[PDB]
Design a protein around this ligand. Structure first.
Ligand SMILES: Nc1ncnc2[nH]cnc12
Ligand code: SF4
Length: 220
C-alpha cells in the first residue's frame, strides 16, 4: 500500500476511534510520556494506570524522581514486574537532573542516551509529547508493518532494518496521532486472530492472503 495512503487511512481511523483519553495522553510532556512508555514496555495498560497516577502524584517532576531514594521507587513499582526498568528509570531521572538541569531533554540524541531508552522509545517520547518527526517500532508496530509481508525474524539485523517501512509511512504532519494510532492498532492487529476493524484491510497483504500467521517471522 502506498505510504501516503497508509498514513492517511490510519489518521482518518484515529480521528473516529482514536480514544486518546489515558492519563499520559492528556497535557502531555516528555516526562509523562517517558514514564508511561517505560511502564507500558512490558505491562498491560489496565495494570499501569494506577501506578502512573501514583508516580505522577509522588513525583510531579523528573527532579523529584531523581532525588527520591531508589528503595522508594522500587517500592512504588512493586507489582509492575521487570524491575530493571525501574532501576534504569531512576538512573535516567538522575541523568536528566545532572546533565540537563532537571529539564527533560527534547532532542533525540540526549533522550536516546538515557538508560532504558532506545531508538523507538526516544522517538515515541518526542513525537507524542512535542510532535517531533520520528517513527516508532515496538512489538505492536512490527506486527502491523510486517503483516508489507515481512516474513523474516525481526531478531535478524537485516529484517529489523527493513522494518525501520516505519520511516516510509510515518508523516511529519500529525505524527503524534499517527504514532499513537499505530500502537493502538497493534495492541487492540493482535498476535492471534487479528480483527482485520482495521483501516489497512483494503491493502494489507496478510489480510488479502489470510496469512497473518507468517508475519513477523518467528525465531528460527
Ligand atoms: N501508547 C501506548 N498505548 C497503549 N499501549 C502501549 N504500549 C506501548 N505504548 C503504548
Ligand atoms: S488488515 Fe489484519 S493483518 Fe493487516 S494490519 Fe490490519 S489487523 Fe493486521
Amino acid at each position: 500500500m502506498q505510504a501516503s495512503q497508509f498514513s492517511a487511512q490510519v489518521l482518518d481511523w484515529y480521528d473516529k476511534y482514536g480514544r486518546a483519553t489515558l492519563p499520559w495522553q492528556i497535557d502531555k510532556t516528555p516526562y509523562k510520556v517517558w514514564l508511561s512508555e517505560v511502564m507500558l514496555q512490558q505491562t498491560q495498560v489496565a495494570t499501569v494506570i494506577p501506578y502512573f497516577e501514583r508516580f505522577m502524584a509522588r513525583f510531579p517532576t523528573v527532579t523529584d524522581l531523581a532525588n527520591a531514594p531508589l528503595d522508594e521507587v522500587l517500592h512504588l513499582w512493586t507489582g509492575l514486574g521487570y524491575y530493571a526498568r525501574a532501576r534504569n528509570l531512576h538512573k535516567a531521572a538522575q541523568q536528566v537532573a545532572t546533565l540537563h538541569g532537571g529539564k527533560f531533554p527534547e532532542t533525540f540524541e540526549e533522550v536516546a542516551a538515557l538508560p532504558g531508552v532506545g531508538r523507538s522509545t526516544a522517538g515515541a517520547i518526542l513525537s507524542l509529547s512535542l510532535g517531533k518527526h520520528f517513527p516508532i517500532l515496538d512489538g505492536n508496530v512490527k506486527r502491523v508493518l510486517a503483516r508489507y509481508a515481512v516474513s523474516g525474524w525481526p531478531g535478524k539485523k537485516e529484517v529489523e532494518n527493513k522494518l525501520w517501512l516505519s520511516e516510509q509511512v510515518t508523516p511529519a504532519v500529525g505524527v503524534e496521532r499517527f504514532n499513537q494510532a499505530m500502537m493502538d492498532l497493534g495492541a487492540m492487529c493482535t498476535r492471534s486472530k487479528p480483527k482485520c476493524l482495521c483501516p489497512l484491510q483494503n491493502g494489507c497483504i496478510a489480510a488479502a492472503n489470510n496469512s497473518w500467521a507468517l508475519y513477523p517471522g518467528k525465531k528460527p
